[PDB]
């Protein structure tokens, strides 16, 4: 019968609880507290311009009706309890296709303290959207955002505040960066207010900074370009009488440039303007024509 006391407490707790009404309807606004613990930062994609992120999206708000007097003072209720009480709706302003896992039992823990403070956390897999500026490719340092705000409740009813001091709220795991191209730098958080046709809604913001690694592209494209240009400048030291040799030597450098440029420009994602590697490739490609026309006039 050691569970009967707790079952009676809980059934009395849910006696006449109306989940459609947020806590303190006519009283002060509800003040949700948010905190993210990014488990692993997924593969950023250049083509689709989406980045996958994993989070343990934590929440906490003070609900007055759920207070109780009991022996345990911290109820670690199951996952099914989370649906009957109020749960604030928190969507992602720029997330294309998210997913909440349902692996072996819905991943949601609900803790009720004696005071009435709740705790509520999910294990999402967010797939946001971040516009990129490839004007400095492949040396760009762009920042992908993540905006989450309350829905269906204006600013006069629900206000978000970071759980801890904002510098130490959005935490990234030590070895969780399953990311290959870029390198992670830090986090930046900033509250805000976004006015719309319906009303004024509160909107938290998070900026993740990224900087592309160049070590691969150095041994991929730039160094073959430099080698090809240096090779095309070798023709001047050949003898002026051996005409066919110099002609073949000049033509094959252009052939190499064409092959290299075609191989390199394929991986570049489609853009309207011209990337910063295009200028280098164009100049590297024009110097060989210069040397060829020089040989011609000679």
């Amino acid at each position, epitope marked *: 019968d050691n569970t009967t006391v707790f079952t009676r407490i809980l059934d009395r707790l849910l006696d006449g609880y109306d989940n459609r009404l947020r806590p303190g309807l006519g009283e002060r606004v509800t003040e949700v507290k948010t905190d993210i613990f990014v488990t692993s930062f997924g593969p950023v994609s250049d083509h689709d311009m989406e980045y996958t992120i994993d989070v343990f999206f934590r929440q906490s708000w*003070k609900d007055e009706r759920l207070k109780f007097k009991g022996p345990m003072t911290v109820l670690r209720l199951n996952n099914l309890m989370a649906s009957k009480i109020w749960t604030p709706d928190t969507f992602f302003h720029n997330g294309k296709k998210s997913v909440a896992h349902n692996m072996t039992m819905p991943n949601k823990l609900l803790r009720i303290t004696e*005071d009435g*403070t709740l705790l509520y956390t999910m294990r999402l897999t967010v797939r946001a959207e971040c516009p990129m500026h490839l004007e400095d490719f492949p040396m760009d340092a762009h920042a992908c955002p993540l905006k989450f705000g309350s829905y269906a409740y204006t600013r006069a009813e629900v*206000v978000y*505040e970071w759980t801890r*001091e*904002p*510098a*130490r709220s959005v935490v990234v795991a030590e070895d969780g960066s399953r990311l290959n191209q870029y390198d992670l730098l830090g986090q*930046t*958080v*900033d*509250s*805000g207010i976004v006015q719309s046709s319906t009303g004024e809604y509160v909107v938290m913001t998070t900026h993740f900074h990224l900087k592309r690694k160049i070590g691969y592209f150095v041994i991929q494209t730039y160094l073959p370009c430099i080698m090809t240009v240096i090779l095309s400048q070798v023709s001047f030291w050949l003898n002026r009488e051996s005409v066919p040799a110099r002609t073949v030597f000049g033509v094959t450098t252009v052939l190499t440039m064409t092959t290299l440029s075609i191989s390199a420009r394929n991986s570049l994602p489609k853009v309207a303007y011209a990337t910063a590697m295009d200028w280098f490739i164009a100049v590297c490609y024009a110097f060989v024509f210069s040397a060829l026309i020089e040989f011609a006039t000679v």
Partner: antibody
Amino acid sequence: QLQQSGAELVKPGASVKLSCTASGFNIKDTYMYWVKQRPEQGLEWIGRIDPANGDTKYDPKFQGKATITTDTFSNTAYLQLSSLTSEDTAVYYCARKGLRWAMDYWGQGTSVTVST
Amino acid sequence: NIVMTQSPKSMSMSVGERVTLSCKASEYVGTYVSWYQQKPEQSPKLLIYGASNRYTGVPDRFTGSGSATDFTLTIGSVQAEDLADYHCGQSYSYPTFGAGTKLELK
């Protein structure tokens, strides 16, 4: 909203205990701060306590010289100093976090003078 | 440690004139600056929290604007009682305050 202890006079080397009582709200909701102010200078931060869990942080320059403990039941936060020198002769404040982490409610402040 | 440089150090302005203060922040602080008013021999009060948001009970002449690292307070028609000290303090991280500005009427 907030009250503090009366003016304090103590000789150097001893330790004094200051109190900030919050009336009208349970402190277990918000944090509590402590700020000192020298004469004709800018404010300076001391520490930060969380009455929900008991966690504390401190300004690296005051670390080891100040201790912040709270009594959730009597609804009061206590600041107990270490062996204090004749230098820190200034007023101490207690604050409560506001909306955007701006310390909105301030106490009248107590004056700690180190004399002989 | 974040440092908060406040300028000017002290300035005097006549009644009914426009007054503008600046609080340059060396590190990054994302719009969590808060301006405090301290009259002589009283306790500080909260004027502006965040940026361009007025705490309740504050007159309409107190207005501020904010950016990533540059912050500005803009008083309207200064009055007789508005002479006090003004402190800018960021709470993005473990909070720290500025030096402080004293504004005596002329």
